[PDB]
């Protein structure tokens, strides 16, 4: 998978950011995209679970209406190993949102253990 994130950014409070990660070497449609924040003060918090195959989205109750997640279409490098991108838009950042952001690939395509993150990228540092 070798997930690659956009990279660290510095920003003034009371505003919005778009953070993007580029998948490689695994079909993008099959596996869910799982967006995550690790705030050093607050520990780990969940952000979102977007399906790249349809418009199915799932979001944590603490962040309703505050964050909008979307995905691009894939590009066929070769059969069963494509390249695709996903990004999230987070409105109205504050001091509380100063940590490391990761996106991840779902574990399985089917079964009760889907929507569970397996591969993780290096991540980006958000300082606000």
């Amino acid at each position: 998978g070798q997930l690659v994130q956009s990279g660290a950014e510095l920003k003034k409070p009371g505003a919005s950011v778009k953070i993007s990660c580029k998948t490689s070497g695994y079909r993008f449609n099959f596996y869910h995209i799982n967006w995550i924040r690790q705030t050093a003060g607050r520990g780990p918090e969940w952000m979102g679970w977007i399906s790249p195959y349809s418009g199915d989205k799932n979001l944590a109750p603490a962040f309703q209406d505050r964050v909008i997640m979307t995905t691009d279409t894939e590009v066929p490098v070769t059969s069963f190993t494509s390249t695709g991108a996903a990004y999230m838009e987070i409105r109205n950042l504050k001091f509380d949102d100063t940590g490391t952001y990761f996106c991840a690939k779902g574990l399985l395509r089917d079964g009760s253990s889907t929507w569970l993150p397996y591969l993780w990228g290096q991540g980006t540092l958000l300082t606000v």
Partner: protein
């Protein structure tokens, strides 16, 4: 952190330690699915357990998991020095998102 752990785990080189992860009846484990993760603060985590005891690809059989009606446990044996990381337990349902819990440091006493 509705999914509470013990926050103080230690084991000796070659012995076996156990880590617990419990919570309320609204965010529980009997009616939920439990997954376990190795997360060094600063690095990207790694999967160990996904369903409730099933072992992830690329994990030596020294790890295992069990689930009671009120708490979930992992029993790690052969504690090499590289096990000094932090484990965050995850409670997830089939049709919803996981609820990560607090963090438990693990200490390998008796190393060199």
């Amino acid at each position: 952190s509705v999914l509470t752990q013990s926050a103080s785990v230690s084991g000796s080189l070659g012995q076996s330690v156990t880590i617990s992860c419990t919570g309320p009846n609204s965010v529980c484990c009997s009616h939920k699915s439990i997954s376990w993760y190795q997360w060094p603060p600063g690095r990207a985590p790694t999967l160990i357990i996904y369903e409730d005891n099933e072992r992830a690809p690329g994990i030596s059989p020294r790890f295992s998991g069990y689930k009671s009606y009120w708490s979930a446990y992992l029993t790690i044996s052969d504690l090499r020095p590289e096990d000094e990381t932090t484990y965050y337990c995850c409670s997830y349902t089939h049709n919803s998102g996981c609820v990560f819990g607090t963090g438990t440091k693990v200490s390998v006493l008796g190393q060199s």
